Design a protein around this ligand. Structure first.
Ligand code: FAD
Ligand code: FAD
Lengths: 437, 437
């Protein structure tokens, strides 16, 4: 009618993509934007967003490389295997990782045209409630109109501005997976699942890794398991600086001089910041429409309907506040919105009992409620916990037939196990059913 | 005062163990026998039964050894890991395996007395409805009386008697996990999940294996997958002799000349039989009490309640007919019987939806009815199938909301995936649930 496109998505990640290929799968004409702003270290990559280029894919691949070395050094010789001169080539791992990422970048290209979604390689910005201005990447504007707009820009790794040298001298998850030079003696700053996973496979590869955590590691997860992971990581050679953080970074002849709140200065080889990520919003001119944005984390504020502060606009994925930063949790929410918008669907997003799996030296799969968080919502009185690397932790409700609220496992292949249990939780499994299984 | 014991258990395997302890855990005077008759190659072992000494445990340890290699060969180098002079010491592996097996041997021993279950290391024989005779291990016979008697003697590998030289020249699973000398060029006769697993890890270790099958592999599971597993094993270097079996085995300078039905005669270093296992009942004197036994496999015929024709005697584990040969399936079955007997329990053993995992080169975990099993039971119009190393087979009912009845996954970690999804099936999952997951 009087709109260039019915569906104008901003961001080519799993979410934005997942929704586009869905809106076009129901007739609607969809225009999709995706442009990778270079990292703080000038690193760039192809179409696919975070998960593919600097997330799940490269992360898991790296992990595997680290797990091999771990298997060789711990078990290999005990199981009758004999080998000589065991060494690891960093550049070989990267070339393999980056090679695979590129074969996906192309695999996703030939995917858009197949779904017939007009893809433009340019960074977009909000011109008007129904209009989207953009720059094709030289900068000359080009405007477009759409019946509905989706914001799926996700987030980008956060680096502190108050810390002198941090921004310029350190790297992030954005750079590590395509890093040319050897990581060398590495300092990892943060306690996220990313921070521990990175310092996790770096240590397994045989690097001098050191993690600086302000307070706790894996905040948001069950802390009885979090502590077991940290202890294990410490036994494997990962050293933690508890309560100490970098105050300033200085260059010293191809080495980084890090000064901690400790007043202690230990010069490292590579500094990696993984203190969290904040939504990529600053370039979307949102103040011009007074959108509901969370200042703390820079995310769009979205109701479960996925509707924004403005009726015309929507938000899905890592940009939405309180929405778990997972590839799958982002794909579905995008699928549903497409049906809500173009198939007159009545289904709404389900954010409960989604399983996450941290790929640390010792894996930690989690689905449902933490123990402590289950106490806040239901109280110790009404919450019962059971144990049942063969450790498993089941958190269930006292008052309603010990129905399982949460499930946590710190063991080999936790990712695999937790995924199955996740479906059992949705079917409202109960301890009764477990012991009798 | 009537009998010497309240409970007399013949068999020290998983089933016998689990039961005796559960019986003693509720106030019953329990006597338990266990005596490992030497293999056809004179191989003997400590207390714990099959799973521990010549089953699950060792099998899994061996597989893991082979798996390492497979990682070295296939993936190691691609991930930046370099090394020299890769070799495998068979002896080192057995000493590691056997060491662990012995650590368990002692664990269980100290466990029984810890649960106060009078244990005799003698092989038993039925004297009458509630009297058991046994011989210490010259001979003397000691009788003992019991209110309830349980037989849990499991099975032992089968070697054909019609084939000349087989019994004397060839080996079985009883032998391999403690084999002094190298297996060398190995011929594995049979297609059982044991048959494939063994030839699998032997192959992964780097031996010249050869599997002679009658017709099909893994009869009883979903053939669609059984074909995948065979194909993959072939690509990995396993040679299958289809529809060709040995008709005679001859000795020759430390090698064995195997003459096949093919009219072809080739020579191997080691010939392993895994064509199936038959219940160890022959020496129980059961035919004295006209027991109901399945003639083809020498198994006791069991009640849903684990009852024989003789109400004073019960049967559990692997000796019972149509009872799946899994360590867990024998424990739960042996623990219910105990409660049933000594704690007036009204509970019955459920056999449906029990998960198995085949540790072949490519793992294949299964749970629920097979595709052919489903059809014959429910009908093709009634049943629909859905397919997801990333592919899973779902066999669900058309008529009742596509409730899953069979889950088959051939992948990296089938065991884990199958285990989890197993519980889901018991909760009566639907394809509708899976799609939503
Ligand atoms: C190291 C790491 C490991 C992870 N591992 C896992 C895992 O194992 N499993 C899991 O489920 N999740 C994992 N995640 C999280 C997962 O990657 C994200 O939650 C998922 O990618 C969400 O995608 P999204 O569409 O919401 O945002 P994104 O995937 O980040 O997509 C946003 C895209 O839009 C583009 N863009 C941004 N701004 C603009 C603009 N204004 N104009 C045009 N284009 C723009 C960006 O280039 C970006 O590529 C991991 C994350 C990280 C960092
Ligand atoms: C190679 C192999 C691999 C396997 N892997 C797995 C697996 O991975 N997972 C799984 O769940 N299951 C596995 N199984 C099956 C599992 O081992 C059995 O199903 C389980 O051990 C059942 O034990 P049971 O107590 O019923 O009998 P058994 O374990 O065989 O116990 C019977 C015991 O009684 C003793 N006995 C026999 N006669 C007498 C006598 N008259 N007097 C005194 N004692 C006697 C025998 O010496 C024997 O030790 C495997 C089996 C094999 C052969």
């Amino acid at each position: 009618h009087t709109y260039d496109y019915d569906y104008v998505v901003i961001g080519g990640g799993p979410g934005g993509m997942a929704s586009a290929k869905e809106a076009a799968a129901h007739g609607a004409r969809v225009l999709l934007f995706d442009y990778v702003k270079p990292s703080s270290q000038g690193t760039k990559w192809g179409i696919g967003g975070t998960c593919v280029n600097v997330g799940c894919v490269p992360k898991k691949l790296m992990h595997y490389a680290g797990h091999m070395g771990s298997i060789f050094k711990l078990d290999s010789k005990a199981y009758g295997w004999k080998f000589d001169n065991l060494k690891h080539d960093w550049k070989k791992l990267v070339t393999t990782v980056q090679s695979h990422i590129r074969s996906l970048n192309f695999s996703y290209m030939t995917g858009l045209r197949s779904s017939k979604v007009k893809y433009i390689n340019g960074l977009a910005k909000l011109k008007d409630k129904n209009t989207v201005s953009y720059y094709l990447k030289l900068s000359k504007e080009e405007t477009v109109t759409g019946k509905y707009i989706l914001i799926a820009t996700g987030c980008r790794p956060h680096i502190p501005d108050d810390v002198e040298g941090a921004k310029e001298l350190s790297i992030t998850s954005d750079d590590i997976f395509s890093l040319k030079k050897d990581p060398g003696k590495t300092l990892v700053v943060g306690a996220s699942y990313v921070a521990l996973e990175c310092s996790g496979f770096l240590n397994s590869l045989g690097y001098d890794v050191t993690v600086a955590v302000r307070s706790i590691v894996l905040r948001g997860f069950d802390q009885q398991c979090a502590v077991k992971v940290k202890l294990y990581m410490e036994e494997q050679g990962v050293m933690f600086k508890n309560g100490i953080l970098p105050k300033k970074l200085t260059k010293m002849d191809d080495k980084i001089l890090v000064e901690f709140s400790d007043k202690t200065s230990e010069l490292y080889d590579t500094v990696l910041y993984a203190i969290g990520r904040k939504g990529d919003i600053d370039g979307l001119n949102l103040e011009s429409l007074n959108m509901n944005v969370n200042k703390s984390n820079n995310k769009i504020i979205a109701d479960h309907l996925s509707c924004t502060n403005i009726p015309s606009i929507f938000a899905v994925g890592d940009v939405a506040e309180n929405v778990p930063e997972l590839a799958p949790v982002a794909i579905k929410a995008g699928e549903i919105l497409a049906r809500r918008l173009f198939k007159d669907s009545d289904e709404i997003m389900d954010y409960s009992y989604i399983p996450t799996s941290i790929y640390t030296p010792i894996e930690y799969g989690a689905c449902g409620y933490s123990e402590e968080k289950a106490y806040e919502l239901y109280g110790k009185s009404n919450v019962e916990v059971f144990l049942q690397t063969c450790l498993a932790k089941l958190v269930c409700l006292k008052n309603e037939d010990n129905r399982v609220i949460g499930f946590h496992y710190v063991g080999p292949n936790a990712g695999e196990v937790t995924q199955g249990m996740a479906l059992a939780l949705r079917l409202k499994v109960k301890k009764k059913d477990f012991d009798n299984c």
